[PDB]
Design a protein around this ligand. Structure first.
Ligand SMILES: Nc1ncnc2c1ncn2[C@@H]1O[C@H](COP(=O)(O)OP(=O)(O)NP(=O)(O)O)[C@@H](O)[C@H]1O
Ligand SMILES: Nc1ncnc2c1ncn2[C@@H]1O[C@H](COP(=O)(O)OP(=O)(O)NP(=O)(O)O)[C@@H](O)[C@H]1O
Ligand SMILES: N[C@H](Cc1cccc(Cl)c1)C(=O)O
Ligand SMILES: N[C@H](Cc1cccc(Cl)c1)C(=O)O
Ligand SMILES: [Mg+2]
Ligand SMILES: [Mg+2]
Ligand SMILES: [Mg+2]
Ligand SMILES: [Mg+2]
Lengths: 259, 259
């Protein structure tokens, strides 16, 4: 009989496509040696053939999708003014206010892309023709309880369109084309618009104007959404825990690095 | 006569390829309106034609270079254990110990990629054939005095090879091919190996083994280097201040967003 600790170890080495049973009478040491051999070959094949990281590769594929669709690629600060949090309406009565990683006395690690995207929409409206379409992909940070769907360090895609054409139908079309392009199954569940995979939230999306826009110097209609890249990878690759998809020292493209 | 404040404003709108003189008798308001028109057209042309961010595009071009050359693409944590700093030999007598952005009580924003690259070399040596070649590109953070060559939030490329072929000559060949591929002029100045553009340091590079390797479980020869992407962009585009190349709300591909 395998111990729970032994089973935890084998689960670290198990990949979703393996068809190995941990509840059949082979001893731990030989089930471990089998999976170790498989995972070493997996890494050797990546090293020999493609050599790209899942998170980097997904970011580049999403970038090509949105650039192609007419969205400007933004790279804005990750370390942001603490003031941006309150100005997003995130006060002591929200879950998020307790989730901020503060840095120094006036800065924090951004928990979302919305403040920077708002600032870019306002500034670019002075220069670019209507409608203004932008997107950003990059690290975001939230303190979280331990859970198979949450990372404290994750990667967000955020896109926003401002001006003409900012309808819920156009927003759903972007989301639908995007996820069908990636091969991710989803349901849009009705502003309040969430993109679900089963009970996992892939995205929250919105349609403006909303009262908050005024604080950011925004007075035009808009649509947009935010997506977690590690959740997309978790669904795409059928990972049991989002840790497999994270920036990590423990996993490379979902393969354990502790061999 | 232009005021210094007026000149600062015009310098924000000036791009290196402009051939406009701020010391000739045109009034401020018309020099400003001229440069505003030019910068709006610059942004409109980016939006119409390519839509890619300089920092993102450079990261993707560097990624293709190193992948093609046989290096595995790594994406490791940006928020790292504080312990990694001391284990890198960075104690109270180094400049760096005073430059760390601490997060919480046991974490910090990484000021360099070396700790994570060391960990990946050790782990991958259990699985990959000799030599082991890896690289990472991503955010790094250091507290800095105000200066035209330093950002507090920047982007590092780090690469490392471990095992056979780890000679200074092979290291210089990687650097030389890399910078000639990017079109960046440089001089290698002699371990202690720095890559200079004039008096600007583009990279510091090294040849192991060194005593520090032991703390990280490394006992093989190695070569590697770290490069700042915003310094490469600053040189490539002849920016006067590295702020033009940063993750920023103030500049897009070196164009002022305050129009
Ligand atoms: N801790 C996290 N780790 C990974 N991805 C996240 C995390 N928090 C949010 N995301 C993703 O970012 C997107 C937009 O963020 P947001 O809608 O604010 O998250 P949220 O509503 O807190 N989701 P949840 O925490 O699962 O209820 C979401 O659709 C998630 O896929
Ligand atoms: N604050 C910064 N902003 C942008 N790039 C940086 C910064 N610090 C270091 N880099 C780049 O990262 C590379 C490796 O880092 P490292 O050699 O530790 O920097 P360094 O020796 O402190 N350079 P300097 O601070 O200019 O004397 C350097 O060659 C720089 O190009
Ligand atoms: N950071 C994302 C990005 C986003 C997209 C559209 C509109 C807005 Cl305001 C924000 C989110 O929180 O869902
Ligand atoms: N973070 C870089 C990366 C690097 C490359 C090779 C060897 C080492 Cl140990 C470190 C630097 O500090 O120069
Ligand atoms: Mg949440
Ligand atoms: Mg949500
Ligand atoms: Mg320095
Ligand atoms: Mg140096």
């Amino acid at each position: 009989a395998l111990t729970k600790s032994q089973t935890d170890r084998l689960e670290v080495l198990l990949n979703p496509k393996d068809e190995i049973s941990l509840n059949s009478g082979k001893p731990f040491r030989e089930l471990e040696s089998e999976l170790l051999s498989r995972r070493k070959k997996d890494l050797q094949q990546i090293y020999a053939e493609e050599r790209e990281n899942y998170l980097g590769k997904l970011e580049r594929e999403i970038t090509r999708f949105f650039v192609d669709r007419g969205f400007l690629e933004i790279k804005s600060p990750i370390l942001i003014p603490l003031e941006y949090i309150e100005r997003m309406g995130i006060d002591n009565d929200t879950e998020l206010s307790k989730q901020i990683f503060r840095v120094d006395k006036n800065f924090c690690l951004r928990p979302m892309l919305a403040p920077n995207l708002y600032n870019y929409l306002r500034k670019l409206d002075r220069a670019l023709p209507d409608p203004i379409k932008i997107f950003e992909i990059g690290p975001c940070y939230r303190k979280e309880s331990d859970g198979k769907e949450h990372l404290e360090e994750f990667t967000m895609l955020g896109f926003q369109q401002m001006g003409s054409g900012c309808t819920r139908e156009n927003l759903e079309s972007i989301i639908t084309d995007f996820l069908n392009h990636l091969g991710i199954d989803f349901k849009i569940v009705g502003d309040t618009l969430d993109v679900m995979h089963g009970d996992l939230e892939l995205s929250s999306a919105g349609v403006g104007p909303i009262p908050l826009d005024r604080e950011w110097g925004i007075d035009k209609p808009w649509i947009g959404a935010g997506f977690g890249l590690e959740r997309l990878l978790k669904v795409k690759h059928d990972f049991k825990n989002i840790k497999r998809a994270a920036r990590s020292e423990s996993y490379y493209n979902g393969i354990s690095t502790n061999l």
